[PDB]
Amino acid sequence: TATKHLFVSGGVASSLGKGLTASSLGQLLTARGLHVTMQKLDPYLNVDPGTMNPFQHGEVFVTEDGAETDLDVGHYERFLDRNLPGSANVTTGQVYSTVIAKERRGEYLGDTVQVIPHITDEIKRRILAMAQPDADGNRPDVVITEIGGTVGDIESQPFLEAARQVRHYLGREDVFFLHVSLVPYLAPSGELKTKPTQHSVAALRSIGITPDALILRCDRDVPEALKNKIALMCDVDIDGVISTPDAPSIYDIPKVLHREELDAFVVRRLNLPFRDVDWTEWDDLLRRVHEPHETVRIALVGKYVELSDAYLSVAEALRAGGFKHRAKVEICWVASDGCETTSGAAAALGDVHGVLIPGGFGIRGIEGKIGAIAYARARGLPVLGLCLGLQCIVIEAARSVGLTNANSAEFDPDTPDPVIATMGGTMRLGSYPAVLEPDSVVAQAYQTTQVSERHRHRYEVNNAYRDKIAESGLRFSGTSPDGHLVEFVEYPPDRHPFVVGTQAHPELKSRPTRPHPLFVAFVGAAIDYKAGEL
Amino acid sequence: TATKHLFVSGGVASSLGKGLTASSLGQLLTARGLHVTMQKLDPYLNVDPGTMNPFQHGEVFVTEDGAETDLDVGHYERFLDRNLPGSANVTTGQVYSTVIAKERRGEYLGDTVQVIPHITDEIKRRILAMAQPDADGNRPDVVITEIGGTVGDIESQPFLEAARQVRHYLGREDVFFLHVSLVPYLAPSGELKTKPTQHSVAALRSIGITPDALILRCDRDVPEALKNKIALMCDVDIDGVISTPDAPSIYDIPKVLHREELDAFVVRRLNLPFRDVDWTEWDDLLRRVHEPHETVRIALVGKYVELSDAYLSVAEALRAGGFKHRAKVEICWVASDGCETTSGAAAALGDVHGVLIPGGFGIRGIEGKIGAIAYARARGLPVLGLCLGLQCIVIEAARSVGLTNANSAEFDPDTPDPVIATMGGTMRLGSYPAVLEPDSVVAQAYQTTQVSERHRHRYEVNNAYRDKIAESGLRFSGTSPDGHLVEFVEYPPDRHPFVVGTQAHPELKSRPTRPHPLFVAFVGAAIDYKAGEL
Amino acid sequence: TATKHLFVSGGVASSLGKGLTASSLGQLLTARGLHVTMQKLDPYLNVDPGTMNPFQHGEVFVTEDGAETDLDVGHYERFLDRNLPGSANVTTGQVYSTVIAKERRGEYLGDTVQVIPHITDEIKRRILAMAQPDADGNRPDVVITEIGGTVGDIESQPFLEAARQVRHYLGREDVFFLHVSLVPYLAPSGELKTKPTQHSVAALRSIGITPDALILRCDRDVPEALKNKIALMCDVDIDGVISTPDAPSIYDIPKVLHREELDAFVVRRLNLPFRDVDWTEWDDLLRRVHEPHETVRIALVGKYVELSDAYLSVAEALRAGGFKHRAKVEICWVASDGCETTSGAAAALGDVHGVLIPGGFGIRGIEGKIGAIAYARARGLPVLGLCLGLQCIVIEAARSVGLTNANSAEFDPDTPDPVIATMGGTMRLGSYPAVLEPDSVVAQAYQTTQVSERHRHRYEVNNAYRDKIAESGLRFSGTSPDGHLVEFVEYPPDRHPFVVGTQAHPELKSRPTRPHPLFVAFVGAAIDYKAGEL
Ligand SMILES: Nc1ncnc2c1ncn2[C@@H]1O[C@H](COP(=O)(O)OP(=O)(O)CP(=O)(O)O)[C@@H](O)[C@H]1O
Ligand SMILES: Nc1ncnc2c1ncn2[C@@H]1O[C@H](COP(=O)(O)OP(=O)(O)CP(=O)(O)O)[C@@H](O)[C@H]1O
Ligand SMILES: Nc1ncnc2c1ncn2[C@@H]1O[C@H](COP(=O)(O)OP(=O)(O)CP(=O)(O)O)[C@@H](O)[C@H]1O
Ligand SMILES: O=c1ccn([C@@H]2O[C@H](COP(=O)(O)OP(=O)(O)OP(=O)(O)O)[C@@H](O)[C@H]2O)c(=O)[nH]1
Ligand SMILES: O=c1ccn([C@@H]2O[C@H](COP(=O)(O)OP(=O)(O)OP(=O)(O)O)[C@@H](O)[C@H]2O)c(=O)[nH]1
Ligand SMILES: O=c1ccn([C@@H]2O[C@H](COP(=O)(O)OP(=O)(O)OP(=O)(O)O)[C@@H](O)[C@H]2O)c(=O)[nH]1
Ligand SMILES: *CC(=O)CC[C@H](N)C(=O)O
Ligand SMILES: *CC(=O)CC[C@H](N)C(=O)O
Ligand SMILES: *CC(=O)CC[C@H](N)C(=O)O
Ligand SMILES: [Mg+2]
Ligand SMILES: [Mg+2]
Ligand SMILES: [Mg+2]
């Protein structure tokens, strides 16, 4: 049948969890054998999130095709176990620059270029593009489009109008509206309130959209009497009124939605091929999530100590590495600035079982990350470095063999030894192939000598320093196919059981149901270190 | 005191006449000795109206500084008798491209770039820029900002939010909101309806704006009982409820607003220096408008026969030329396509007293305009050619002396004689100086040999053909100061009493209270032709 | 099938003609063989319109069962040719007093009595009651419910909410929403505007109602391009976008709606039994409306004659009387106060062909109505008196025979001769039987001696004065079955060709397709007077 469009909107307030609810619905539909693709509409004017501070706004996700996207695409890829195109993230910035650029070229042939229909046609074009056959030739069954911003706000109006037009042009049989609302609890009276959902749905209806179902985000179960009140006042089928209480883990959200039979309601309402959910893969994940056999502590040596969306894909990849070993990864958020000195690094990393040095696109404090690697090497702690992490492993190795002032030309342009430098240079974005040295730590982890990983960097290992850096025992165990670019570094296992660096972001290809081989090997080495210390 | 901001919004429906009401208020405040400047906020995405078809969307106005703007700037200049900057026209296209370009350069330093505050800050910046001292050093007393689009529509939301923020930041003492509404008449019941104004004001209030006054656009006088109902339901001072019935001429609108004492209400509400209106100049204009001593028929040989906004400044300049002679100019709208043949041109121009060949930026049908000039020359009819008009006078002169296939390379790239060609070339926009031949028709009209006029063209008279074209008797009576570019052409008065062409758009510098010298001389020649035919 | 509910709402402004559009649709569906009943929901607090000044708010219609209702019930009866129950008019006043009375008796059993659901349940009950089998045992096919007030106003909110709940409970298959909007014309630009319809439909959608069709009230045909714009922006089937221009006569509206195929769209959308319209009866009416063979002038001697709805059923009955004779009745609206003196009555009634003295519930000036009858008797003008009219005929007869101070005790309680008096008394409402004198003017008009007419009065002919009044020649040609109450009066044809009075309101039983026998005889006598004057 025709590709179906399922729009996810939000009401009352932001940060209710629309993205994770949409992803969980995507997981449930995928588990029913449906081909699901997902898309995020971001009402911000940044053409891409590359200009945003990730320490304030969250990580930048990078797709296989090299697009810098909102972190939500990461949630979609993790719940669908699918590579999404750069088209899966639409911003107001992209839409307006595209339309204005076409206007300047005279492509609208003398027309007054307007929000309606020219801006809404562009958004609609980007929504409908998701229903085109992919590279393998497959057309999706369902396109889940998450509409960023809140209903009733100015910024979301062109997106919501485009979604209303998609419904008008494709008909009610091919389009479904899911609206996420808040049911707050008032502690003095002890009651849940439906009034915000009532008003939010009236604002949604006022812009021409009739919700087919409602996600009632709450800190508790929404009683049947409240669901009945909402069904009546909002004119939503009672089977489409979904009590969605805060879940203990993000992996529990599909079970919350399935208990309320939201996915079965969606399949019936869109007249999609029906098949029962195959719970094999997700039940296996939930056993690894809720029933670990051991705990392991990993230091994430980033900008700060607060649990951060700036390292979301890294944190998820670490946990997934744990799941593979039926282990619980406890992340010790360590501020890199505190690891600069040997006593500072000892106080911060003395009780961990592994040290992860993550990526740091646009950051400035590097001496703390180098300090953490120097401590971990001496302590015998496993190390996994990602992009900036590999660069810090390379800088620390060069300094350990006499190049005292070795650095990246990015962080010290006046360094006499730029062991990390541009090839200014070439920004490497998206998937790049690498060839691994057979029997190396990285080749043993991947169980192959030919791999591909996603990149986001313009600084590379300076090849003029390979022989000098190798004096530390560090091996260039992975390179580009022509051998010019260093892609992976590692110490021999007889010197350090696990010290590995990668120029790429393997965390982006990690899934909770498909852990990344490097994170599996890293967590495995951390479990080994813990057992050796007992 | 502080520069005041007066915002003009529209409700119920578009095309009510907001621009002319704002201009008329601008005239009334100017006549009270206040320094008034005006600005139009256009919600369209066209960075400038240059890509719009003027035959569908109206003429492009060109300012002294060379900006291509909405025709509304023309209304402002005509009612204020002032040159306005390119900043007097803000479009959504300009705002979004400026903000997106700053975002791409990293000027927002890691911020999420949003409609609020980044888009609204840019609009607010453009509104507040109008309050800066001009080139002569003068700061305006009042900035009248017309908000395009209708209240309740999506496209106007960022502009209205910016205006609300201007009020918030400057205070109620420095900001005034004027809302234009429709009071429709229902013929079966014979009654006027206030309900649309009631609902429009509630929509305006819902976005945070309280109107200080209301323009009640109607086909009849709004009775006191209806004004009282509106004052009460909309909470507007009865002195700010303005009955604005459709006026016989646009020049009558200041008298309609003054009778209702809107300008006195505005001056008192904004605590502006009070002075009575000096009616000397406007009463003089109204006597020329309503009490002409003679009538004269002028053919406007444009694309079509319907009264058009595509030639608004030309039509206004023709009427102003008439006012100077205490004459009524009757415009005979003649489709150029019908003047290609000698019999067609005779049928179309046989009963007129003058022929105006207007500008035609982006048009295709030129043979009809050349045909009209050939007929007018043989008939002894006065001719005034503007931009394309001069080019058509030059082409017709070249063909009359044997260059049968003479043309502009714009309309016939394969012409063996490109008498009009690029210097591709250089687009000339805005004010350019010209030096006139003393005792020429053009120098006698201007009463000076040094002039400046506004341009909008890239094709010029090909200097290689000057000697050949002059064989017709045509004189290059005006040039650029270095003598390289032809700016004016004319025939000797002994051959044709008035056949003049200009590369510029003198109509743009015309005002109803200050007619342009070329239009005064042209209409004067048309009055002479009429009298000679009696 | 199930009884269908068709709701008629209004937007933009009041007095657009919702009632006549609904009635015309009722006529079209009746002509397709459907059993249609109609109901008006009035948002005013008057329990019945009896306390309203009819000279400000329009006539009070009286049903067979004696309910005093809004004049709209009259339009319904005239277009359906059916007697409607008192239940066909619901007011806010009725609903709130019913619910408050139930609350005071404890019928809500400890509940908080609320607008939702208690007021809306009462309105819904009154809407659904219209679908119950009538006295003959027949259940209607369609109930057309007109919702008074304008969408977006406070007063209509409970009615609109009840209609939304009827849709929710019965489903989309049994409920249809028709929304009436205004398409205004802007004379300076010459354009029709769709913006008010766009905004009105968004307000209707915001309160939970999706219109199935739109009535576009306009002073001209709405072009296809504007209908296409509305279909797209309002998301209404193009087949349901109805151009409804101002019609020359109210009886032309069914043809306007049929041309746009609204009735066929309604029948298909509600899955009603389909049958073609039988145009026999209505085409016959339209020939009498548009092709009269003669014109006749009738004075309507009302207390206050603005040309208002205060005498709507009288004016319609006069026209229907004309139709029967293939004549056009021109109503000369005459203020009764000007007919008090014989010279005043001569100036006012000198050029008419008949004099109608209508009912005057709540009036104070009766001397002018008596003066008009005295003039008409002397002039030989036909007279038809309704309720107060009969009473004035009786008072004038008594005074013409020497009872100089004869009057009604209603207008002069101190009269020594109350020829009109109570039995205080008994208010007679609705249908009452009368027995007519065989071979009397009234029996010859009705062509029967047994009739029934609707009443609205408490004053009667004082039987103690029958012998004295009869001295004038006046006959008591119609009485109650027991002979106690005077129902009809007339002069013998050998004294006056046509001077008739009735205590009732025969105009209420008049239909354009079924003229009332008294109005047929009256207009016939007026045609005779005109012919005798030539
Ligand atoms: N059902 C649920 N229970 C608990 N936490 C939840 C949740 N749904 C979402 N979250 C939390 O919300 C966080 C942010 O993701 P979310 O889905 O809320 O984005 P969003 O759509 O509301 C905002 P934006 O569009 O700016 O990205 C997740 O990291 C997760 O921890
Ligand atoms: N009071 C009035 N009486 C008669 N005509 C009037 C009028 N006010 C305006 N008009 C007419 O309206 C025409 C268009 O100018 P107007 O002021 O209506 O623009 P606007 O602000 O409504 C639309 P936009 O923003 O797209 O330019 C004028 O050419 C004039 O003839
Ligand atoms: N198509 C049409 N052509 C001409 N006149 C029309 C018309 N439709 C309605 N009218 C006129 O409009 C007036 C108001 O009609 P109507 O009673 O139906 O309006 P309404 O329903 O808005 C008032 P209420 O609020 O009292 O119910 C009447 O004088 C009627 O004759
Ligand atoms: O009327 C409005 C208000 C706000 N916005 C948009 O809201 C966006 C901010 O998105 P948020 O959801 O964070 O709103 P908030 O900060 O105002 O309130 P909190 O829930 O965070 O406490 C901004 O990007 C702005 O464009 C509108 O579009 N319209
Ligand atoms: O909800 C809406 C509808 C329309 N619009 C905006 O209205 C603009 C069109 O401006 P108009 O005033 O011409 O509206 P219209 O054509 O829809 O109706 P008419 O009055 O002309 O009959 C378009 O440029 C669009 O962006 C909104 O911003 N929001
Ligand atoms: O927002 C509002 C305004 C008014 N009303 C209600 O409107 C009713 C008056 O109804 P009208 O339609 O007569 O309004 P109006 O007189 O103000 O304007 P026009 O006729 O000129 O169009 C009153 O009974 C009042 O309660 C609302 O319910 N809500
Ligand atoms: C990828 C990473 O962690 C840092 C990127 C840095 N700016 C670069 O190496 O180019
Ligand atoms: C100015 C005018 O009328 C036409 C401009 C034309 N395109 C040109 O000469 O460049
Ligand atoms: C019936 C009428 O209109 C006036 C008569 C008066 N109210 C009465 O007889 O009670
Ligand atoms: Mg999200
Ligand atoms: Mg304007
Ligand atoms: Mg009605």
Residue numbers in the entry:
A (entry chain B), B (entry chain B), C (entry chain A): 7 to 429, 443 to 553
Could you give the paper's own sentences about this structure?
The combined data indicate that 7947882 and 7904688 are prodrugs activated by the EthA monooxygenase, which then target PyrG, a cytidine triphosphate (CTP) synthetase catalyzing the ATP-dependent amination of uridine triphosphate (UTP) to form the essential pyrimidine nucleotide CTP. The crystal structure of PyrG was solved by molecular replacement on a 2.0-Å resolution data set. This structure showed a bidomain enzyme with an N-terminal amidoligase (ALase) domain, also commonly known as the synthetase domain (residues 1–278), connected through an interdomain linker (residues 279–Pro298) to a C-terminal glutamine amidotransferase (GATase) domain (residues 299–552), both domains displaying a Rossmann-like fold.
The enzyme, in complex with either UTP, at 2.0-Å resolution, or UTP plus the non-hydrolyzable ATP analog AMP-PCP and the glutamine analog 5-oxo-L-norleucine (3.5 Å), is a homotetramer with crystallographic 222 symmetry, consistent with previous studies reporting positive cooperativity for ATP and UTP due to nucleotide-driven tetramerization. In contrast, in the independent crystal form, grown in the presence of AMP-PCP as well as UTP and the glutamine analog 6-diazo-5-oxo-L-norleucine (L-DON), AMP-PCP lies in the ATP-binding site, as expected, with UTP maintaining the same orientation as above. In addition, a covalent adduct was observed between the Cys393 sulfur and oxonorleucine, as expected from the reaction with L-DON, therefore confirming the role of Cys393 as the catalytic nucleophile within a Gln-hydrolyzing triad that includes His524 and Glu526. In agreement with similar observations made on E. coli PyrG (Endrizzi et al., 2004), a putative ammonia diffusion channel was visualized connecting the glutaminase active site in the C-terminal domain to the synthetase site at the N-terminal domain. Despite being located in the proximity of the ATP-binding pocket, the Val186Gly substitution does not provide any obvious explanation for the resistance profile to an ATP competitive inhibitor. Moreover, this mutation should have a destabilizing effect on the P loop and on its proper positioning within the ATP-binding cleft, leading to a decreased affinity for ATP.
